[PDB]
Amino acid sequence: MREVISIHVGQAGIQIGNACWELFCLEHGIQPDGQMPDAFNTFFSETGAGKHVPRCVFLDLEPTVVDEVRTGTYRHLFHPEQLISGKEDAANNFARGHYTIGKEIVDLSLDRIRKLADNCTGLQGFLMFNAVGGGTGSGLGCLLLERLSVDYGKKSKLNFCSWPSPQVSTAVVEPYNSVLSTHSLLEHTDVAVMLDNEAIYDICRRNLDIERPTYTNLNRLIAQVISSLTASLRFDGALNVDVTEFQTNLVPYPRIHFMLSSYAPIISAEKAYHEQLSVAEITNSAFEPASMMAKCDPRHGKYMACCLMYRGDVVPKDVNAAVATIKTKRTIQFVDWCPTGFKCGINYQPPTVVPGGDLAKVMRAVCMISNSTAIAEVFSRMDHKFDLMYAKRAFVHWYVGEGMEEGEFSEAREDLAALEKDYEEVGI
Amino acid sequence: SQPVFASPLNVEKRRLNEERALMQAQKANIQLPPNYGDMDLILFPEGSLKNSNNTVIPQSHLKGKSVALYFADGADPKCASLLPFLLNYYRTMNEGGANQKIEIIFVSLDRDREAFESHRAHMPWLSIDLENPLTEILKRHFRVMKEYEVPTYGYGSRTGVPSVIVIGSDGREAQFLPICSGLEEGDRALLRWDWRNTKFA
Amino acid sequence: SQPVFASPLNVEKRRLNEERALMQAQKANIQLPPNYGDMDLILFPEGSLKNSNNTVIPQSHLKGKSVALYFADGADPKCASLLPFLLNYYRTMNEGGANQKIEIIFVSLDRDREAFESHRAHMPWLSIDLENPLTEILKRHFRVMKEYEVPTYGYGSRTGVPSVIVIGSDGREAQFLPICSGLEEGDRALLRWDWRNTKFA
Amino acid sequence: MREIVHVQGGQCGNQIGAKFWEVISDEHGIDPTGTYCGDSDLQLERINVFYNEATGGRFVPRAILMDLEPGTMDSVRAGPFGQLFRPDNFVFGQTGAGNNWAKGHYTEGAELIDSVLDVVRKEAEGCDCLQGFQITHSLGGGTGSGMGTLLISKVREEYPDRIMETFSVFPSPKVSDTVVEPYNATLSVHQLVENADEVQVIDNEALYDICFRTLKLTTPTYGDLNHLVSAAMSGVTCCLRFPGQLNSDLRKLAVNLIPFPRLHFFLIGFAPLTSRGSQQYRALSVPELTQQMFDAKNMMCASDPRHGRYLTASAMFRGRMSTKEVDEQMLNVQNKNSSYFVEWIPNNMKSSVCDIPPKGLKMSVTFVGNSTAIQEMFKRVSDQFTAMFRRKAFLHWYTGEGMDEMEFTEAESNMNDLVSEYQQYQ
Amino acid sequence: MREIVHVQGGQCGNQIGAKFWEVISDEHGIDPTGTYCGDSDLQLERINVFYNEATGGRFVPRAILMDLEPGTMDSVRAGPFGQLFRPDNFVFGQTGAGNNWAKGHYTEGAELIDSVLDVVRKEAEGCDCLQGFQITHSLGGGTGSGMGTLLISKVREEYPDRIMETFSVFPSPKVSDTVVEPYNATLSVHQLVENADEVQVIDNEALYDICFRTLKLTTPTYGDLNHLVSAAMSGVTCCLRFPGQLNSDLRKLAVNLIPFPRLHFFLIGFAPLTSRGSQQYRALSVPELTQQMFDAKNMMCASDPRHGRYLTASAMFRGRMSTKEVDEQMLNVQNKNSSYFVEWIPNNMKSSVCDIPPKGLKMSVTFVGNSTAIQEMFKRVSDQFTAMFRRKAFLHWYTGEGMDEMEFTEAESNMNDLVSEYQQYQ
Amino acid sequence: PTLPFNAQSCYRSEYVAKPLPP
Amino acid sequence: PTLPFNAQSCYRSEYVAKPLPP
């Protein structure tokens, strides 16, 4: 029936996917075994007596992060060969992950993809989780998308890339990995969402009041966003929008598919007692510049387009009262050619809290994902970093030794320059 | 089978319930061994609990409570630091109400009876004496240990002393309060204690 | 007469069953000697099994479980290797469920009482005491031996220590877990355990 | 999955390596007799990186022992944890290169390298794919420097793609061990610079300074000093052996610390480091790890980093620890000490989390920093090397052992050029 | 079923074959007094390949002792398990051959052959239906080389279609005792090329090198090293006595190692071989078996096989084991070491499995390889023969017993074509 | 003096078989 | 002196008395 295939590539992909899949299990009431005590068909298959298995693949050339999945609590949940492991690390090298080591793992991945795709028709599309900062997240993440786009042409391909933080990076060669990724995910991805690490750090700081957060704390919040985004497919709602209708309303031009993310409310057991969680108040916090999840202050651009997802006891007339207030407010500016730029989505089902986590149980939630022109800033700052380090051939010899030709850096740079100009000319 | 399997509480519970199931099967498509849902135990014996003024309180009057086991040691500086804040929290919780809501049963890691009585003389909530094997069996069941002295069966030590664990009706941990835990959010994790959800059914 | 004709359990069962057969035949074409299908025994007497709290439990407590005998030696490095995985498997696949699936009965091959109790303290499932004849009789029954000390009757040894063997109601070998055997699936053969079809009934 | 092949060469390499396997055995809970103790899964799911099953239940180390004389072999074999190693993994000499680079690299090490290259190939080809090699040696000696660097040249040619990690010790500024130190140091460097993928520098002056001011130990022997060196050796490779929130290995370090291929020399630091007396006074928190980490007192190279600028730096955090204060503090240190960091690279610092703490502690960090302040050690060698070569002292052994004179001029020209290229980025 | 008749000629023949029967009797459970012990069915299911019932319960070997002196057969008889042999199977000589092949083959052996060949007709015919014979002898000696081969000639004529297989120990290459070696070797070889089906070559210099490099034994007697030769003897004939997953036989080895009728000389190796020190620490696996078996260090024949090409090789495995590792290791070894394998025969390896291992071990393998690296053995004898024969050295001893001079020329020519015939396939 | 090993991963501490909502 | 023979064939180990199905 109506199914969506999830792909997790690299460290960032796998760890996020671990958080994504545990939420879906608790959501639909399936167990670590995979058998429940027909909403779940979008994520889980039907196998044997009563068991459901995920429609996912795990890819990494590093064994130690995907083997640990096979070791952990959820052994029996995942398919034995839906977690593909390499033998040797990508080591932050786009060339290594795209040319040298990743070639023998692509065809092993495509075997699992097509066999999982061909069980039924009406496949909505694909969810992609990767880190553009990383080696296999960027290199092997790319290589999969050339092989996917040529055969499975038609279908939607959403990407949830963890863009590098402006101040913090997980790596020092990551400007090189960034420029090469952003070249090759332009024409292979239909919708790209920017996730940022320090953006979710300071959300965890001022909202949940967690002075000591970690990657597990971050990935809970990210898994809530993915669940809120696809809640329309799984559960019936008053006014639903699916995966396919995102790119209709968010992507006005072929080159322009980079967009923000924000989730509200993010309230612990501390604060949850002491406000209305009113529809007006949660949509006010959603548009707040401090609640962005990409670390770019969105006031220095124009909101090109916007989508709002709603969960729980949300009535349609409260949405319209909410969105009228936002239009009235002149802190948030709009582009001239898009006079109406809001697409609402309402689902009846409230979010389900994982026990002993950090979010509180709440009646309703908003997941606002929006295309803006302020993305031209984060592309420009990353560009400035790449130009200084490249100009005298730093770290080049790693890349050019591994197969790629000196001239893919120049071609990727000029292509990013076209992306600079394209965002500039639109936003005037 | 919650929160643990290899505990003396769960072993005694499995014994009694499967005994009871076999007798019901003898008297009467019955499922052996009985489900964890159909399993039942009595947790605090009638002569287990006693109040401040040293009078017996039965288990049956723990109905409609948010009840927590306080595993504590007399000599521990961390315990001595935690104690006044928990005292203030207990007072301000139980005073703003006609009837009382939260309740703390004290489990000791003290060296001897003299230390037990000396530390217990401060506390106004309920306590279990040191000689009762309830303390030891609850301690193994909820995985509290000061140090790895006793064989535990492949468990990791869930807590260090001190720790407050909110319990349910069947010995299931209702919620974990992270003083010295995965969150390390010491001395003010007592705020996280919710009382809608954690009811001694 | 399963798995071997020449075993103490089988000869004891033979004696009891055809004792009753002759008695009722004299009391009355009743088939003599009775079929192995007609044969039924009590595998564990009243005082055999003791759990983690050293409380005796009858055989009747094991209905609808998947029971496995674990022949183990305290000093064997292969047993030292096998033990944590066995603990973890018991732990998780029994805990994470709405049924109590499996149960392990420990049979010792240690030197003496001190070693036996020391190794048994590290263990949450059931055990048989080393003094009790049943351990030796089970060893001969299932043909496990560390070395050729006790004379098997001109046949092979089924396995060596350590070994996990799924058993039935009548001493029938339900399935052999290939820890150190023909398959040689060290520490991963645990996953071959099918707890559906092997019920102690 | 992955395996690290260990090579220990010379007197100083062997004593360091002997202590290294003692803490790895301790971390993985390996009894000195070979067996397994401890009864936990996390100790053992990645054991193939350093050990091998022996169908008797025992784990043999993945190590090669290498010397030109059997004196120091006896010390390692007769020590505790000495029966761990396979007896055939040892290789012997009989002559012993009298701390002469030429004699270890051309005459006495040449006829031995046939035999031990077999032992490497025996262990290298043995597995699925190997992750790389790790080599501990001394650059001041003969059998460690001269014959050790020969193997580095040999095994790089046969396994080009695999990584090349060397733990080397250097000549000290103050004390004089092995009077021909600059001759051995200079000749080792201009070969190790093109044949080793990452090099990490230890100096005995730095170690004694740590025993002065931090540990407050009054009589540290080579037993104590090698313990601290061994602690960073395990700390740099922790994430290969244990899971974690963010993964890293040796190639993560290589791609994130090497701007140009010529510059691959590091400064190693370990934190925390406090005396027995001050153990229970100190709040082990991520703020106080990073302030001790960025101290000159903590580096194990005796070159003050405050003179130079950190070109790039890496920190492998270990333990249960929150990653915001991991992430923010690396950024936060770059903000105030903006003068200590190079400008034309944003975010010089790389961080990783390794969620299994070392034995006896709760959190720890190992610092691997590519600093241009390592120029101060290289200048001192070149200054000394030119002092002797100009008057051609101690040359007749080096030139009488089948080695040309013009090798020396190439040695000083290359290493001076290494000094010159640090200068432009400072 | 099948029976092998064992034949021993000479002092080397009697001493080597004495240890062969001690390890067969151990394997099948026979006491020195000759009764069975140890109540196992496998041990007696195929016992008539070697033994013979007495209708009194006891077993006698099917062996024919043979020596031209009465001394060495008194040594065999008087030891333990010397009571096992039938006294009538001994055949005695009073005179003896003084390491003169002529008097062994023409004069002294002629009056003795009619007696020993009387025995061997009586024993062989008396069984059910014969399978093969086997001969253990030395070619450096007088009676092992001289009268031994005359039996080989005469029974080949008599029993034309039966297998004949020889464990012959050649002259030692380097340190060479019994100074008339090449005269005895060359004369024995050209007579053995038209009259033997399988020939297996062992050298003493090969055996002694095993005792340091592999076994590491301090004072190894003939008793110690004959344990190794006899274990090779048992390996080639495992399947005749025990069931197998894939069966073999002496005849199966002939049709799968001998491409052309004259090329029937083989190299013999055994694996595993470890010191008593290294025994508990070694992992015994089939991939580890197959790489300790492909060594110059492991062959019992003192010629380096890396200098030549394995025309066709075989490995007979013994133990509880799986069948890829017997065969995927074959593809493993043929692909990467493609230089040591001849080309115009693809996939040169015969493999076989026998379930019951040698006593005390769990797996083992014996290696039989037809190589053209044995040209370097015939050549070394060939120059030493023509060095002596040119100058007529020691020829009067040979020409006085009825020999002619033309026989020596034919000895070289039939040796030298075998040298050249190995050349044309390399 | 020895101490037992009492550490488990972030995964084991945070990811268990959670009870389902009623 | 000698030892008894504690080896068992592959066939006897895995071709055993098989339990008859109901």
Side-chain angles (χ1 to χ4, degrees), chain E residues 212 288 359 367 391 426:
Chain E
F212 270 88
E288 191 280 330
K359 280 172 70 49
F367 183 79
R391 308 270 300 276
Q426 173 200 61

PDB file of all heavy atoms in Angstrom, chain E residues 212 288 359 367 391 426:
ATOM      1  N   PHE E 212      65.026 -28.559  14.646  1.00  0.00           N
ATOM      2  CA  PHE E 212      65.235 -27.243  15.242  1.00  0.00           C
ATOM      3  C   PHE E 212      64.145 -26.234  14.933  1.00  0.00           C
ATOM      4  O   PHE E 212      63.575 -25.662  15.846  1.00  0.00           O
ATOM      5  CB  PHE E 212      66.664 -26.678  15.205  1.00  0.00           C
ATOM      6  CG  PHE E 212      67.422 -27.100  16.442  1.00  0.00           C
ATOM      7  CD1 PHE E 212      68.075 -28.310  16.385  1.00  0.00           C
ATOM      8  CD2 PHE E 212      67.179 -26.546  17.709  1.00  0.00           C
ATOM      9  CE1 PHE E 212      68.821 -28.723  17.487  1.00  0.00           C
ATOM     10  CE2 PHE E 212      67.824 -27.014  18.847  1.00  0.00           C
ATOM     11  CZ  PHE E 212      68.677 -28.093  18.722  1.00  0.00           C
ATOM     12  N   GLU E 288      44.724 -22.649   8.963  1.00  0.00           N
ATOM     13  CA  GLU E 288      46.041 -22.580   9.567  1.00  0.00           C
ATOM     14  C   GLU E 288      46.839 -23.852   9.245  1.00  0.00           C
ATOM     15  O   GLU E 288      48.072 -23.801   9.155  1.00  0.00           O
ATOM     16  CB  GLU E 288      45.903 -22.259  11.053  1.00  0.00           C
ATOM     17  CG  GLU E 288      47.214 -21.910  11.709  1.00  0.00           C
ATOM     18  CD  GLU E 288      48.081 -23.101  12.091  1.00  0.00           C
ATOM     19  OE1 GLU E 288      47.520 -24.183  12.380  1.00  0.00           O
ATOM     20  OE2 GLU E 288      49.320 -22.956  12.050  1.00  0.00           O
ATOM     21  N   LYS E 359      45.824 -40.230  17.098  1.00  0.00           N
ATOM     22  CA  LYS E 359      45.460 -40.276  18.506  1.00  0.00           C
ATOM     23  C   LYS E 359      46.060 -39.080  19.252  1.00  0.00           C
ATOM     24  O   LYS E 359      47.260 -38.822  19.170  1.00  0.00           O
ATOM     25  CB  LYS E 359      45.783 -41.630  19.149  1.00  0.00           C
ATOM     26  CG  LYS E 359      44.768 -42.727  18.863  1.00  0.00           C
ATOM     27  CD  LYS E 359      45.185 -44.088  19.344  1.00  0.00           C
ATOM     28  CE  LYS E 359      45.220 -44.322  20.840  1.00  0.00           C
ATOM     29  NZ  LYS E 359      43.981 -43.861  21.496  1.00  0.00           N
ATOM     30  N   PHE E 367      50.760 -34.290   3.117  1.00  0.00           N
ATOM     31  CA  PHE E 367      50.905 -33.619   1.834  1.00  0.00           C
ATOM     32  C   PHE E 367      51.777 -34.475   0.925  1.00  0.00           C
ATOM     33  O   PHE E 367      52.860 -34.904   1.316  1.00  0.00           O
ATOM     34  CB  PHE E 367      51.561 -32.249   2.017  1.00  0.00           C
ATOM     35  CG  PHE E 367      51.690 -31.439   0.755  1.00  0.00           C
ATOM     36  CD1 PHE E 367      50.593 -30.754   0.249  1.00  0.00           C
ATOM     37  CD2 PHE E 367      52.886 -31.380   0.046  1.00  0.00           C
ATOM     38  CE1 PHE E 367      50.700 -29.965  -0.897  1.00  0.00           C
ATOM     39  CE2 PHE E 367      52.991 -30.628  -1.120  1.00  0.00           C
ATOM     40  CZ  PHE E 367      51.907 -29.897  -1.577  1.00  0.00           C
ATOM     41  N   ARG E 391      86.784 -41.433 -12.950  1.00  0.00           N
ATOM     42  CA  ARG E 391      88.104 -41.785 -12.436  1.00  0.00           C
ATOM     43  C   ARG E 391      88.066 -43.217 -11.873  1.00  0.00           C
ATOM     44  O   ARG E 391      88.966 -43.621 -11.138  1.00  0.00           O
ATOM     45  CB  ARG E 391      88.503 -40.743 -11.395  1.00  0.00           C
ATOM     46  CG  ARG E 391      88.386 -39.310 -11.896  1.00  0.00           C
ATOM     47  CD  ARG E 391      89.553 -38.643 -12.580  1.00  0.00           C
ATOM     48  NE  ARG E 391      90.532 -38.701 -11.522  1.00  0.00           N
ATOM     49  CZ  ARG E 391      90.613 -37.805 -10.529  1.00  0.00           C
ATOM     50  NH1 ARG E 391      89.733 -36.816 -10.453  1.00  0.00           N
ATOM     51  NH2 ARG E 391      91.571 -37.905  -9.614  1.00  0.00           N
ATOM     52  N   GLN E 426      59.056 -27.295 -16.910  1.00  0.00           N
ATOM     53  CA  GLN E 426      59.301 -26.177 -16.017  1.00  0.00           C
ATOM     54  C   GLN E 426      59.688 -24.944 -16.835  1.00  0.00           C
ATOM     55  O   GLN E 426      58.916 -24.596 -17.742  1.00  0.00           O
ATOM     56  CB  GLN E 426      60.364 -26.550 -14.980  1.00  0.00           C
ATOM     57  CG  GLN E 426      60.790 -25.363 -14.129  1.00  0.00           C
ATOM     58  CD  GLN E 426      62.134 -25.623 -13.489  1.00  0.00           C
ATOM     59  OE1 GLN E 426      63.138 -25.814 -14.180  1.00  0.00           O
ATOM     60  NE2 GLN E 426      62.173 -25.657 -12.157  1.00  0.00           N
TER      61      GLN E 426
END
